[PDB]
Ligand SMILES: O=c1cc(Br)[nH]c(-c2nnn[nH]2)c1O
């Protein structure tokens with residue numbers, strides 16, 4: 170375990186349960202694919218923190234069953250006309266009226282930005298990338314959040330990294346490119 174112990178100690182139970190459900194759907198064992206497990210929890214938590222930093226500004230799409238995620242996406246499209254994305258995004262921004270894809274990477278933010286923009290191939294979805302180094306990259310350099318909220322996300326990601334490092338897990342996690 171070790172990685173599993175750390176995941177259960179640093180993420181709240183709701184997130185852990187959501188991550189285990191995601192992995193039981195994919196067919197993957199969180200006791201085996203430990204680095205994926207941690208990356209899923211981290212990404213889930215960034216999405217929830219992002220949303221929570223809003224007069225009810227964000228709708229969370231990530232973390233729901235696919236049925237219900239698509240139900241939410243469809244509802245938003247029918248009530249705004251916003252083009253329906255091709256891949257499930259992570260949040261909807263009602264203030265700006267755009268979907269958001271959140272990326273968390275152990276590599277350089279620009280590399281992973283390029284990789285996500287190339288994947289989603291949709292000019293509609295705003296993209297926001299975070300590293301474990303306090304760096305971010307976002308479409309048009311439009312970061313959406315205020316400094317406080319982005320700083321809190323940066324802090325938590327760095328803290329997770331240092332917690333992994335103190336437990337000797339960071340090097341495997343960093344080289345694992347799995348989940349990001
Ligand atoms: O950032 C992400 C990385 C991976 Br790998 N997958 C997703 C995803 N999968 N289904 N909905 N979102 C992300 O948002």
Ligand SMILES: [Mn+2]
Nearest residue numbers: 231257258259
């Ligand atoms: Mn997602």
Ligand SMILES: [Mn+2]
Nearest residue numbers: 259270271272
């Ligand atoms: Mn994402």
